[PDB]
Amino acid sequence: TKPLDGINVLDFTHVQAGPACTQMMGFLGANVIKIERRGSGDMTRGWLQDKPNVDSLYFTMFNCNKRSIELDMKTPEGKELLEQMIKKADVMVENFGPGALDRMGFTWEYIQELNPRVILASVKGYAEGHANEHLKVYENVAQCSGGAAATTGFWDGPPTVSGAALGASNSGMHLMIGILAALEIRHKTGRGQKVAVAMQDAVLNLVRIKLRDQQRLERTGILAEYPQAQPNFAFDRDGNPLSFDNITSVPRGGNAGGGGQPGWMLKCKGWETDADSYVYFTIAANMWPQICDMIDKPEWKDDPAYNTFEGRVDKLMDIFSFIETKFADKDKFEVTEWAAQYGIPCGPVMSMKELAHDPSLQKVGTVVEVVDEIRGNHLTVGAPFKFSGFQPEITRAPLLGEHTDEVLKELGLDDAKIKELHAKQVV
């Protein structure tokens, strides 16, 4: 049935990276118990609420398929409870600041004593052993540390952050790989391991293609697929020409192709008024004759100035600019359909509004309406992996401390000691 049926997750996480991981584990069937601060809970509860007093969509979209217990881990009775919970857990996940869990008395060595089967899984900004090992980091700092910011945006503008959570959710998904790898180890050794993912490293893994470019640049002095390789195309903000004669670190290439075949972001009808009225259009090496037919340039088919990648290096941006011309009177969906007739990789810039109400994504279970009778229903992203013999069942995020008493009862505490913990402000 579900991949992680019977896996108990002691979930210390807050914000995005850690909760994304444990939420997805929960979607795949894990029993996730989320430990939260007494009173305020996970910071995302009160972060950019759409309705006052109601848990924000930040919290609900990252904390479905979880139960919530409030715990003051600074008290000694809270530490005792944690020890009992660790003994029943298959994996513990934390994304507190560097050394925080250690300071509570729960180092890797002490956790192994408590449960030689448990997997400790951790997200940090930087890897253990790194000069910046002790720094706290959020999303965009990690994007900067891992190379994405330096290689995203335009040559005449600043390092640019991605809207996608390259630092946070991406780190959580990488940690999920780590946890699952560690569970596979455990089938063989009967033992738990520590796994850790640094945000910088999760970003750098996605920026692998730019480390390719850096070496190419060091070795050859040019990146022929970049706009800057076209003579007199690219200029900095003072109007100085940009060529690879003077570039020693991988530059921003605007909307160039990356690890795909060469492409660009082309305007469609209504771009002046509609921010998302664009398509991405690829000029792949095997598709020149098809492109020539589409744009009625038969004379370009057999001209060596146009029909190889190498011949196009000096003029690719002019070609894109001319192709764009054919899209002036067509919206992004019409251009997408037109390009599809030729087999040309090409698709629209989908707006978040379009994505939220797209029938396909709802049909395939990627955009999902969560039933929440307390807060009102909301949309979330479901499982991005589709399985032949299993469907996720997404349930609403917990209220703060909703399952405190439920969870304490499962640990074997009697009614009297639960009352006692409420009074002592442990729970």
Ligand X SMILES: CC(C)(COP(=O)(O)OP(=O)(O)OC[C@H]1O[C@@H](n2cnc3c(N)ncnc32)[C@H](O)[C@@H]1OP(=O)(O)O)[C@@H](O)C(=O)NCCC(=O)NCCSO
Site residues for ligand X per CB under 6 A: 15-18, 36-37, 71-74, 95-97, 100, 103-104, 123-125, 136-139, 167-168, 199, 259-260, 286, 345
User: 61 to each of 14, 20, 24, how far by Cα in Å?
Assistant: 13, 9, 11
Amino acid at 179: I
Q: Which listed option, a second copy, ligand X, none, makes contact with residue 232 (CB within 5 to 8 Å by class)?
A: none
- Between 1 and 232, CB nearer to a second copy: 1
Q: How far is the CB of 16 from a second copy (least distance, A)?
A: 5
Q: Which listed option, a second copy, ligand X, none, makes contact with residue 218 (CB within 5 to 8 Å by class)?
A: a second copy
Rounded CA separation 24/379 (Å): 15
3-state DSSP assignment of residue 379: strand
Rounded CA separation 244/220 (Å): 10
Q: Which listed option, ligand X, a second copy, none, makes contact with residue 348 (CB within 5 to 8 Å by class)?
A: a second copy
Q: Which listed option, ligand X, a second copy, none, makes contact with residue 123 (CB within 5 to 8 Å by class)?
A: ligand X
Q: Which listed option, ligand X, a second copy, none, makes contact with residue 4 (CB within 5 to 8 Å by class)?
A: a second copy
Rounded CA separation 22/8 (Å): 11
Q: Which listed option, ligand X, a second copy, none, makes contact with residue 20 (CB within 5 to 8 Å by class)?
A: a second copy
Q: Which listed option, a second copy, ligand X, none, makes contact with residue 190 (CB within 5 to 8 Å by class)?
A: none
- Between 258 and 311, CB nearer to a second copy: 258
Q: How far is the CB of 131 from a second copy (least distance, A)?
A: 5
- Between 22 and 228, CB nearer to ligand X: 22
- Between 11 and 324, CB nearer to ligand X: 11
Catalogue the E-assigned strands of 20-127.
31-36, 67-70, 91-94, 119-124
Residue nearest ligand X by beta-carbon distance: 97
- Between 15 and 118, CB nearer to ligand X: 15
Q: How far is the CB of 10 from ligand X (least distance, A)?
A: 12
Q: How far is the CB of 399 from ligand X (least distance, A)?
A: 16
Q: Are 23 and 62 in contact (CB under 8 A)?
A: yes
- Between 30 and 198, CB nearer to ligand X: 198
Q: Which listed option, ligand X, a second copy, none, makes contact with residue 95 (CB within 5 to 8 Å by class)?
A: ligand X
Read off the tokens for 326. Answer: 């054919």
Rounded CA separation 124/103 (Å): 15
- Between 285 and 411, CB nearer to a second copy: 285
Q: How far is the CB of 136 from ligand X (least distance, A)?
A: 4
CB neighbours of residue 356 within 10 Å: 12
Q: How far is the CB of 303 from a second copy (least distance, A)?
A: 22
Q: How far is the CB of 141 from ligand X (least distance, A)?
A: 9
DSSP string, 271-323: TTT-TT-EEEEE--GGGHHHHHHHTT-GGGTT-TTTSSHHHHTTTHHHHHHHH
- Between 234 and 312, CB nearer to ligand X: 312
Q: How far is the CB of 286 from ligand X (least distance, A)?
A: 4
Amino acid at 221: G
53: CB partners within 8 A, 6+ apart: none
Rounded CA separation 414/405 (Å): 10
Rounded CA separation 66/23 (Å): 7
363: CB partners within 8 A, 6+ apart: none
- Between 71 and 176, CB nearer to ligand X: 71
Rounded CA separation 69/61 (Å): 18
- Reference 139, options 161, 119, 111; nearest CA is 161
Quick one: how far is CA 219 from the chain centroid?
A: 32
Q: How far is the CB of 147 from a second copy (least distance, A)?
A: 5
Q: Which listed option, a second copy, ligand X, none, makes contact with residue 50 (CB within 5 to 8 Å by class)?
A: a second copy
